[PDB]
Amino acid sequence: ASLKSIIRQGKQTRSDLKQLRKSGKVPAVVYGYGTKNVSVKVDEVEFIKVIREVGRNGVIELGVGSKTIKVMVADYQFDPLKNQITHIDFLAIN
Amino acid sequence: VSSTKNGRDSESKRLGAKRADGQFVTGGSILYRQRGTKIYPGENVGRGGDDTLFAKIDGVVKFERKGRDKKQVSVYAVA
């Protein structure tokens, strides 16, 4: 129940995302109770390996920058071709 | 010996708006040509026999909303 994210910079061009999705990163967003709209990015293998313990629904400890919040999987855009995630949604469980 | 029976068609009636929004027009100028009440008449705007919107006072055109899902065109005397 742990994950380290990285605050993404503002205004990302298509090429940027493509290059970011070409490696082992997947753009995500965080929003909910006692928090504002913050855009971050996590690892694909690190997310799938930490989503088999709690399963579909389960409280996780995301390291948004220099803080830890309890969030869950609200939505996730999946690509049928080449079975790869493209976007993840985190909602504050608090 | 194949035959046909679909080579008939009527003429096209130039419909649509005739005056732009914020343009100066003179009384009697046509503002819209439609088949029904696509746009209702506003202030200083009458409806013709063929549902044609025309101005009665010389001023600027103004396309606004009337209700929540109906449009309307009006004209103001202010130059």
């Binding site: 799938i48 989503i51 579909r56 999946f78 049928p80 071709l81 079975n83 | 194949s2 035959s3 046909t4 679909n6």
Partner: protein, 137 residues
């Protein structure tokens, strides 16, 4: 032998073949299914030909689902006559399939048995397919 009971117009305009599948890209009835990876026109003759070859090797030991139905009929002028004389008569019914669209769906059978049955029905289809299973992550 799959065709609509009745249609408003007997002459269409040939469905466009571009972009990716609009919907139906996940198996929701069976456990395994055949996913397309190329774009092409699927006629009713081929659809029923692949279904007969799948049930024949399954020996009525499971349920089969068809997520495609010929909705657009296409015409064809016979005995190659001179061009310009109007549209021809209906020849058959087709169905456009884009990459990421599930074709068939099997259930209530061995996982290795469904992998062989789907492979036999893929030889009667004019599109590259791929064996997939119910996803859940």
């Amino acid at each position: 032998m799959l065709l609509p009971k009745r249609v408003k117009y007997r002459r269409q305009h040939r469905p466009k073949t571009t972009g990716r599948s609009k919907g139906g890209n996940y198996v929701t009835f069976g456990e395994f299914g055949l996913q397309a990876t190329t774009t092409s026109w699927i006629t009713s003759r081929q659809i029923e030909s692949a279904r007969i070859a799948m049930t024949r090797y399954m020996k009525r030991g499971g349920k089969v689902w068809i997520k495609i139905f010929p909705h657009t009929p296409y015409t064809k002028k016979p005995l190659e006559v001179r061009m310009g004389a109007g549209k021809g008569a209906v020849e058959g019914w087709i169905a456009v399939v884009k990459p990421g669209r599930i074709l068939f769906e099997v259930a209530g059978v061995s996982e290795e048995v469904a992998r062989e049955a789907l492979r036999l029905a893929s030889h009667k289809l004019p599109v590259k397919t791929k064996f997939v299973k119910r996803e859940e992550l």
